[PDB]
Amino acid sequence: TVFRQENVDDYYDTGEELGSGQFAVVKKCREKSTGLQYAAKFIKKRRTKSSRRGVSREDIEREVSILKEIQHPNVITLHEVYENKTDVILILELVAGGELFDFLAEKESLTEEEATEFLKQILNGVYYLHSLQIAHFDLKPENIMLLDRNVPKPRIKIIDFGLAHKIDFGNEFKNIFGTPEFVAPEIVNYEPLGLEADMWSIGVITYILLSGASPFLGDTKQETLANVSAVNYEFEDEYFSNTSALAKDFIRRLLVKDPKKRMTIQDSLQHPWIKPPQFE
Numbered sequence: 001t002v003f004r005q006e007n008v009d010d011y012y013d014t015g016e017e018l019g020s021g022q023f024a025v026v027k028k029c030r031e032k033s034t035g036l037q038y039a040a041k042f043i044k045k046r047r048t049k050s051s052r053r054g055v056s057r058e059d060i061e062r063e064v065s066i067l068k069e070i071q072h073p074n075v076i077t078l079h080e081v082y083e084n085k086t087d088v089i090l091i092l093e094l095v096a097g098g099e100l101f102d103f104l105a106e107k108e109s110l111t112e113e114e115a116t117e118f119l120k121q122i123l124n125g126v127y128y129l130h131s132l133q134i135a136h137f138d139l140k141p142e143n144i145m146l147l148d149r150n151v152p153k154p155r156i157k158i159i160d161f162g163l164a165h166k167i168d169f170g171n172e173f174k175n176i177f178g179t180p181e182f183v184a185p186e187i188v189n190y191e192p193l194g195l196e197a198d199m200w201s202i203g204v205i206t207y208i209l210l211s212g213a214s215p216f217l218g219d220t221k222q223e224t225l226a227n228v229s230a231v232n233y234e235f236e237d238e239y240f241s242n243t244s245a246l247a248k249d250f251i252r253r254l255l256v257k258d259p260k261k262r263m264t265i266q267d268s269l270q271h272p273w274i275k276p277p278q279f280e
């Protein structure tokens with residue numbers, strides 16, 4: 001698909017840099033015709049077919065295609081897409097409350113109520129995605145944003161659909177790989193992937209929300225990946241002594257090696273606790 005090739009600067013004014021990635025930079029912007037604000041994600045294109053630098057057209061179009069289909073309170077929306085010789089520019093819904101990653105860094109540890117407040121929104125967003133057979137594949141604190149972090153119960157939106165894929169055949173087999181700390185065993189072992197991988201990531205996020213500690217984190221990437229594959233984690237008493245057994249039960253049913261035995265997004269919403277790259 002070809003995108004708008006007029007100079008983005010003729011329709012938008014950019015400002016503060018919101019975030020960055022290996023092949024992308026995100027900047028706050030303002031559309032001239034409406035005065036409304038957005039987050040412009042500039043993704044670097046590949047200059048040749050056989051190159052490591054930049055993102056392939058196929059990968060950019062996949063992210064755009066997925067974004068165009070979604071509309072839900074807990075997921076980011078796509079406003080427009082521009083492009084030029086060097087970048088494809090996605091004009092995304094702005095989430096100005098910062099990364100959950102930074103919010104957690106400033107508060108250390110949350111209560112189970114604060115944790116479930118965040119988790120319930122994350123689950124609702126993932127429920128929406130999984131309902132459309134969309135696997136996110138990159139769920140982690142830096143890919144979850146707060147609309148306003150100066151509120152007791154911040155609302156969130158899932159962002160970064162750079163690894164997202166449609167799972168119309170139940171599974172995708174293409175070496176998709178994210179951040180060692182959050183990837184599921186099937187990703188580590190390069191096996192067919194499905195919506196189940198996201199549920200594992202949710203388990204890791206929950207563990208972090210409740211303790212401020214990462215379950216599989218090692219001193220090196222290989223150590224982390226080895227820990228993940230062996231499901232090498234435990235609930236340290238120093239961190240979980242005052243955490244309910246139900247909270248641990250929730251986590252335990254997500255951090256399951258066999259994708260088929262892992263809780264599904266629907267299971268997670270009905271669970272008693274809730275129910276009301278990778279290289280050297």
Ligand SMILES: Nc1ncnc2c1ncn2[C@@H]1O[C@H](COP(=O)(O)OP(=O)(O)NP(=O)(O)O)[C@@H](O)[C@H]1O
Nearest residue numbers: 018019020021022023024026039092093095160162
């Ligand atoms: N809609 C948004 N609103 C506000 N900040 C955003 C938004 N989208 C992304 N960001 C910020 O920009 C950072 C990078 O964007 P993201 O879409 O996560 O790219 P990425 O896939 O990590 N990049 P790359 O490393 O090149 O693959 C995020 O981690 C956020 O801090």
Ligand SMILES: [Mn+2]
Nearest residue numbers: 021142143160
């Ligand atoms: Mn990201």
